[PDB]
């Protein structure tokens, strides 16, 4: 197909998010991210992971 499949405008394939807050406990580590899904986009969790 040559239309209605891929976008022509610029757009990253895989984004990278940094912890907006992180707490290093004596026996646990917690971090919170602000996973933002830009408009006209769709994210499939399965493709996400923690580096």
């Amino acid at each position: 197909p040559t239309h209605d499949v891929t976008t022509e405008r610029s757009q990253r394939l895989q984004l990278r998010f940094v912890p907006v807050d992180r707490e290093d406990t004596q026996y646990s580590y917690k971090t919170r991210f602000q996973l933002a899904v830009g408009d006209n986009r769709v994210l499939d969790m399965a493709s996400t992971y923690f580096d």
Binding site: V20, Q34, A36, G38, D39
Partner: protein, 51 residues
């Protein structure tokens, strides 16, 4: 002069009573008080974080 000893160039500059600018426009030009990007849906629709 023929007595000149090997030297080395050094460049720099000064810009006082001024403020560094970084307009929030797609082309950095001023096309109105309310820039184009400042009116783009990507920003008015959802909130983001700056760093």
């Amino acid at each position: 002069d023929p007595r000149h000893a090997l030297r080395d160039p050094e460049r720099k500059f000064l810009c006082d009573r001024t403020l560094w600018r970084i307009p929030f426009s797609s082309n950095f030009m001023s096309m109105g008080s309310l820039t184009d990007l400042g009116q783009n849906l990507l920003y008015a629709n959802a909130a983001h974080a700056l760093d």
